[PDB]
Ligand binder design. Structure first.
Ligand SMILES: [Mg+2]
Ligand SMILES: [Mg+2]
Ligand SMILES: [Mg+2]
Ligand SMILES: [Mg+2]
Ligand SMILES: [Mg+2]
Ligand SMILES: [Mg+2]
Ligand SMILES: [Mg+2]
Ligand SMILES: [Mg+2]
Ligand SMILES: [Mg+2]
Ligand SMILES: [Mg+2]
Ligand SMILES: [Mg+2]
Ligand SMILES: [Mg+2]
Ligand SMILES: [Mg+2]
Ligand SMILES: [Mg+2]
Ligand SMILES: [Mg+2]
Ligand SMILES: [Mg+2]
Ligand SMILES: [Mg+2]
Ligand SMILES: [Mg+2]
Ligand SMILES: [Mg+2]
Ligand SMILES: [Mg+2]
Ligand SMILES: [Mg+2]
Ligand SMILES: [Mg+2]
Ligand SMILES: [Mg+2]
Ligand SMILES: [Mg+2]
Ligand SMILES: [Mg+2]
Ligand SMILES: [Mg+2]
Ligand SMILES: [Mg+2]
Ligand SMILES: [Mg+2]
Ligand SMILES: [Mg+2]
Ligand SMILES: [Mg+2]
Ligand SMILES: [Mg+2]
Ligand SMILES: [Mg+2]
Ligand SMILES: [Mg+2]
Ligand SMILES: [Mg+2]
Ligand SMILES: [Mg+2]
Ligand SMILES: [Mg+2]
Ligand SMILES: [Mg+2]
Ligand SMILES: [Mg+2]
Ligand SMILES: [Mg+2]
Ligand SMILES: [Mg+2]
Ligand SMILES: [Mg+2]
Ligand SMILES: [Mg+2]
Ligand SMILES: [Mg+2]
Ligand SMILES: [Mg+2]
Ligand SMILES: [Mg+2]
Ligand SMILES: [Mg+2]
Ligand SMILES: [Mg+2]
Ligand SMILES: [Mg+2]
Ligand SMILES: [Mg+2]
Ligand SMILES: [Mg+2]
Ligand SMILES: [Mg+2]
Lengths: 145, 97, 209
RNA sequence: CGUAGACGGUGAGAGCCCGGUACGUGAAAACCCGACGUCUGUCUUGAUGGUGUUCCCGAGUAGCAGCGGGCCCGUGGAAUCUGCUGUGAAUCUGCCGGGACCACCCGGUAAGCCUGAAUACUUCCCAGUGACCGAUAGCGGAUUAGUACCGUGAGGGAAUGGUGAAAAGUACCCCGGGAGGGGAGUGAAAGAGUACCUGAAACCGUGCGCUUACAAUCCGUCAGAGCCCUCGACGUGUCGUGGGGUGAUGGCGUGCCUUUUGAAGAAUGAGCCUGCGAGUCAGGGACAUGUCGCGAGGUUAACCCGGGUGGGGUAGCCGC
RNA sequence: GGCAGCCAACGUGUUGGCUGGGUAGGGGAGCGUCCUGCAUCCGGUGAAGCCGCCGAGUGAUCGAGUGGUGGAGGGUGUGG
């Protein structure tokens, strides 16, 4: 028997809003700024530390460039494949998308950190030596496009 | 407005409720109607000066037209297919007034 | 797992309706439903109100008088917040309070409210409210009076049914909502909730799909 | 009663009293957008697919040199666009773009012209809405309002709403030259009489109780006799787990806020009251703290459809 | 004799041990006003505002506690 009357917030979900400079009983005459000063009037810049050159100013820059033409992939773990494929078999980009391991559009790569014990046929783009050896030892195949 | 000159009206509220009277003039601009015998007042006039009694206007909504049967009644309207004139209707009986 | 006898205006039972547990048997969540209803009212409210600040009032952009020699207190503008008839210190602006609530939040809150409703046994089945091609508010009033005695009743009617909605519109303590327009605020507001057969079927199918 | 229980007024909270609301109807004449019959204009001297070879397709332009602007680009290694000033190209194995630069391959044809649809804006008009204000607020302006008034100027710029249900706004008599008043009457009330609802505080008195004219004082507090009033039991006043108003007389006693190491300070501010007057606000902005759901998954913006807060929306986002 | 914080034992809040002066400043828990939601209720047999008396709370206060003016609107509760 709950009406619109019987609606209550969670305990502690509501914290009281502080009214600053609303009487000397709680917060008075200074509003949490204390005594006189520029912090008592407006503010201080974040990058300003008293006139001396800041830590973002007396430090060298990092060398080298960012390589705007970088090609990006996403690793898929052999152990994760083994866990998600107890039965095993052929695996492809659509299958991995359905399994939700990588983004649908993104391009995939695999590595052999985990262990494989189920025959899995892997279709991918870039293969590493460890994943290749794991696939070969698990009695399966893995072809790269 | 269905409360027109020459009609007979019955007072609903006020000290003169339940009394019958005859309408004299109507003020559509302020929707106030003047009926003799109701809203008794006293006026002091000095030119030859004395106490004189005149009729105080009453708001039109406080009266209803009484029918020929002696019963106050709402007013409806009908359309005559002969000429196209509009005649008022006593709602309780449907007769024309 | 609950069953309700469908009822007819003639007073005869039509069939049976099965209610799944996973939709109407969840434990109530007072905090969640409170948050959702608060967001509902926050969205309902319109944020149209404004005042004029010191920079928007008319005229008085020049110094009232000289600094020294006047003898009175120092002032800078005729329209300062200290002055009467001047601007306001912090003036409100036209604004909105739309609060986005996640779909699981709203769905879970509605499901909790409906589960509590089914627990309190205020859900019913009606094949049709009034006779077709004849809107009659009096017939609907008599039907609802016979069916229940609570002050407020909520009825869910399909969109294509117009006569029932038109007949039931005028009465004040009763409210009508299409099954696609059901919301937690109206669920909580009314005392009794009634489902039409088509509306309940559509709602259940949409939930299960 | 209700397909109308929106909203105002009527002598107090009215869907059944009226103004009116759901719902229907209705235009002689005029205006803006939407079809349906003389007449006008073009070409069917034209059209479609098929085998080799001998001035035009936008010029003082593209581009270049200097000097400057605007794209994040502030002469930096500086592409692209534009402009001022001088020079100045080809017509297709011609060009310029592809972020000082080019060989082979790769994509488009500059100096000519216009073109609806998504968008921004609201002086004006209509219909509505408001966890917007209710007369020092809200537009300066609910009222002679951009009026009075100030300034010869560009201009600046005010204050001033409420009788009552209706004027039924007090006949008449008396004091007074009038102003002003007292009765009598109107009205529910005149402790609503136009200086008009409610009428506080600063403000100015009257009457009553007590105190004070040997008295040295941030003016009060703690004791405290007397006088006056009050409540019960008991008689003429006396006590009683008594209150009230005054307080003669003794102890203690240096206003408040600032800024200060330091203030009663002879340091600053306040003549007083009534209101007005100060951490507010927007962002898929960011961090950390409680709270809620799912979970290796968590989720949406803009936008589409419901007089409704709902349903859709995988573009992105954050860790794995 | 009473209130309040921390802590230990046991319990579905009692007992026991300590602490409680504080500006700037931090943390925690609340009072009151206006405006909305709803369950509902008060009010011309007198609401709000106005002026007192008596009470009660550790506080901002409260009294669905009453007296004189006033004649038209407000309130509990949980929320925002
Ligand atoms: Mg200092
Ligand atoms: Mg200071
Ligand atoms: Mg400081
Ligand atoms: Mg300006
Ligand atoms: Mg001011
Ligand atoms: Mg203003
Ligand atoms: Mg907020
Ligand atoms: Mg109404
Ligand atoms: Mg009532
Ligand atoms: Mg009303
Ligand atoms: Mg009426
Ligand atoms: Mg540059
Ligand atoms: Mg360049
Ligand atoms: Mg060309
Ligand atoms: Mg062009
Ligand atoms: Mg356009
Ligand atoms: Mg006022
Ligand atoms: Mg002048
Ligand atoms: Mg009388
Ligand atoms: Mg006065
Ligand atoms: Mg008055
Ligand atoms: Mg004295
Ligand atoms: Mg003496
Ligand atoms: Mg002294
Ligand atoms: Mg002393
Ligand atoms: Mg002394
Ligand atoms: Mg102060
Ligand atoms: Mg100093
Ligand atoms: Mg100091
Ligand atoms: Mg000093
Ligand atoms: Mg002095
Ligand atoms: Mg000095
Ligand atoms: Mg000084
Ligand atoms: Mg001082
Ligand atoms: Mg100084
Ligand atoms: Mg001074
Ligand atoms: Mg002065
Ligand atoms: Mg922030
Ligand atoms: Mg958090
Ligand atoms: Mg949606
Ligand atoms: Mg203890
Ligand atoms: Mg302390
Ligand atoms: Mg402090
Ligand atoms: Mg009364
Ligand atoms: Mg009374
Ligand atoms: Mg009272
Ligand atoms: Mg009154
Ligand atoms: Mg109120
Ligand atoms: Mg209250
Ligand atoms: Mg609440
Ligand atoms: Mg609150």
């Amino acid at each position: 028997v709950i009406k619109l009357h019987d609606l209550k917030p969670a305990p502690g979900e509501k914290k009281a809003k502080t009214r600053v400079g609303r009487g000397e009983g709680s917060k008075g005459k200074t509003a949490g700024r204390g005594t006189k000063g520029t912090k008592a009037r407006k503010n201080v810049p974040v990058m300003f530390e008293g006139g001396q050159m800041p830590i973002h100013m007396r430090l060298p820059k990092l060398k080298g460039f960012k390589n705007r033409f970088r090609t990006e992939y996403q690793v898929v773990n052999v152990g994760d494949i083994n866990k998600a494929f107890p039965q095993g078999g052929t695996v492809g980009v659509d299958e991995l998308v359905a399994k939700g391991l990588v983004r649908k559009n993104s391009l995939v790569k695999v590595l052999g950190d985990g262990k494989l014990t189920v025959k899995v046929d892997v279709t991918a783009n870039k293969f590493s030596g460890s994943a290749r050896e794991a696939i070969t030892a698990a009695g399966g195949s893995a072809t790269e496009l | 407005m269905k409360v027109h000159k020459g009609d007979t009206v019955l007072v609903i509220s006020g000290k003169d409720k339940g009394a019958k009277g005859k309408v004299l003039v109507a003020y559509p601009d302020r929707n106030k109607v003047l009926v003799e015998g109701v809203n008794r007042i006293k006026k002091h006039t000095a030119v030859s000066g004395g106490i004189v009694t005149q009729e105080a206007p009453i708001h039109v909504s406080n009266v209803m037209v009484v029918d020929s049967d002696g019963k106050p009644t709402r007013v409806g309207y009908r359309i005559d297919d002969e000429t196209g004139k509009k005649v008022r209707i006593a709602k309780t009986n449907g007769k024309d007034i | 797992t609950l069953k309700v006898d469908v009822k007819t205006p003639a007073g005869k039972t039509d069939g049976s309706v099965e209610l799944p547990a996973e939709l109407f048997d969840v434990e109530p969540n007072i905090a969640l439903m409170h948050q959702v209803v608060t967001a509902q009212l926050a969205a309902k409210r319109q944020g149209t109100h404004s005042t004029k600040t010191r920079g928007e009032v008319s005229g008085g952009g020049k110094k009232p008088y000289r600094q020294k020699g006047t003898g009175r207190a120092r002032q800078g503008s005729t329209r300062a917040p200290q002055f009467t008839g001047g601007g306001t210190v912090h003036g409100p602006k036209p604004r909105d309070y739309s609060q986005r609530t996640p779909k699981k939040m709203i769905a879970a809150a509605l499901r909790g409210a409906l589960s509590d409703r089914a627990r309190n046994d205020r859900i019913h089945a009606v094949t049709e409210l009034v006779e077709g091609q004849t809107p009659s508010t009096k017939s609907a009033k008599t039907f609802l009076g016979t069916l229940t005695e609570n002050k407020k009743v909520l009825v869910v009617i399909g969109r294509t049914d117009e006569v029932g909605a038109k007949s039931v519109r005028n009465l004040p303590g009763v409210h009508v909502i299409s099954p696609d327009q059901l919301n937690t605020y109206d669920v909580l507001n009314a005392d009794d909730v009634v489902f039409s057969v088509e509306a309940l079927n559509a709602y259940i199918s949409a939930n299960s799909k």
